Write a protein that binds this ligand. Sequence first.
Ligand SMILES: CN(C)S(=O)(=O)Nc1ccc(F)c(Nc2ncccc2-c2ncnc3nc[nH]c23)c1F
Ligand SMILES: CN(C)S(=O)(=O)Nc1ccc(F)c(Nc2ncccc2-c2ncnc3nc[nH]c23)c1F
Lengths: 264, 234
Amino acid sequence: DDWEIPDGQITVGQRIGSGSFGTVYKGKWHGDVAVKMLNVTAPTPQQLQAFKNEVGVLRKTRHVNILLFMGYSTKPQLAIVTQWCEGSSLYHHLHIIETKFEMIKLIDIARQTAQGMDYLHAKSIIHRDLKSNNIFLHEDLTVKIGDFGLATVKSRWSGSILWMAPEVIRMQDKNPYSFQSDVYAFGIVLYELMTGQLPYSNINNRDQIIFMVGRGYLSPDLSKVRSNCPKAMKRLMAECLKKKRDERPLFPQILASIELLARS
Amino acid sequence: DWEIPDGQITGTVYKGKWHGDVAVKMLAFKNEVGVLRKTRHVNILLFMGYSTKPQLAIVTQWCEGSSLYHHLHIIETKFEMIKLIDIARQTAQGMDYLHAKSIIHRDLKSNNIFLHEDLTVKIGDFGSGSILWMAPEVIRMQDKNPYSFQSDVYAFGIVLYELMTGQLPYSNINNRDQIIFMVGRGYLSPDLSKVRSNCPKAMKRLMAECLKKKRDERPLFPQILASIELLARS
Ligand SMILES: CN(C)S(=O)(=O)Nc1ccc(F)c(Nc2ncccc2-c2ncnc3nc[nH]c23)c1F
Ligand SMILES: CN(C)S(=O)(=O)Nc1ccc(F)c(Nc2ncccc2-c2ncnc3nc[nH]c23)c1F
């Protein structure tokens, strides 16, 4: 199956986001696009195949709340091409430039994020790295979820611990990821949305945050939420953040909860 | 210390009278009663005391009416959907409680759900001949301990089938032992296409989640409860 973009077609503009996993630029291909170049130097035929399989999984998605896969390139560098969103991440808005969102918009961010996640889940994809860094806000104020590609490949060939549920944080199981681990991360995003800040700010040792959340000694202080946060959401958040994996709701539930209180 | 002396009350249960009408269960154990004192919820059968003169016995209220089993299958009552949903929520209310108190019911079924004044639900029998409600891990008692909160969630799911179908699952297979084998290996599950037209996707979808074969994928009761509440307000 060929969503393969022949090299020469893509002009590669300014760089937007580094990271060992790959570097992202704004480019041109039938208009604005985002091009993510992988840092894999010389992939072998096998590495090339793993990549196409993982792309295979990217082509299972078509939803307004999922950043739009448009193509991939094989030479001279492995790359993923997606739609270009004019805007900033949720992490940028919340923690870098402190954008003040009216409560109605916060909740709407939450609705749209849950929508997209329910979609991924409907298609049996697990994100493994939902964080406010991967939630983008279009100028419209449509949310796009990103960076769910290449889960397997990222592993084989670091700053997401605030979003990791305990099972994830303590690699005991070979594969600790699941829908409810995604749901936990989403809860952390709720926390960001309604406290306006990241968890565990008053603790300064990463190794120790890792230990303590991982054993259930540490969880996010929910009393920090803004006073005009609906009670139903403080509750929902709490339930997403349950330390025990099997106590966390799935996304169809979450979505209905958030859409009911979106009428009050 | 909650004992009730002899000549004050009046195998299968008999009807009695102690501080009004009571149901009295006619059969080291003293450890159990400690937990039943604090088991206090509207939709759970209320514990009023124990006895051991003559034989060891548990006493609860007598509530007028009959089991969910009795209504649905024997006398076949045509409830409204709003009622069935109401009933299913109330059953969740209690199980939710019982799990809050660390109690695995181990034997939830419709004959263990009573309708007081044909209206309010009361759970009991948490102090085989009932395979229809057993989950797979349970159905093939395979190791140290097969029971779990999730095991109960499976059985509650069968009741949801009962509620909306109005009939017992596998009603078209006459060999009990085969049903055992079949649910054990994951080959046979209840036919969800037998629900009545007017059951919302959600109810039918909740049922599915409850009846998932893998133990750990089933919801726990707060969510079942929160899900029915969500579907309730339609
Ligand atoms: C298939 N993709 C959705 S993904 O899951 O594999 N991730 C992904 C792949 C290639 C990409 F170019 C992007 N996009 C970005 N990734 C990291 C940082 C920023 C972006 C990005 N993408 C689109 N518009 C943007 N505007 C600012 N940053 C943007 C991605 F999120
Ligand atoms: C905590 N108890 C409920 S229990 O788990 O120890 N089980 C139990 C013990 C004694 C009981 F009498 C009952 N209740 C009944 N058990 C069997 C048949 C009927 C009843 C029953 N209980 C209350 N009201 C009724 N009305 C008709 N049958 C009734 C029980 F459910």
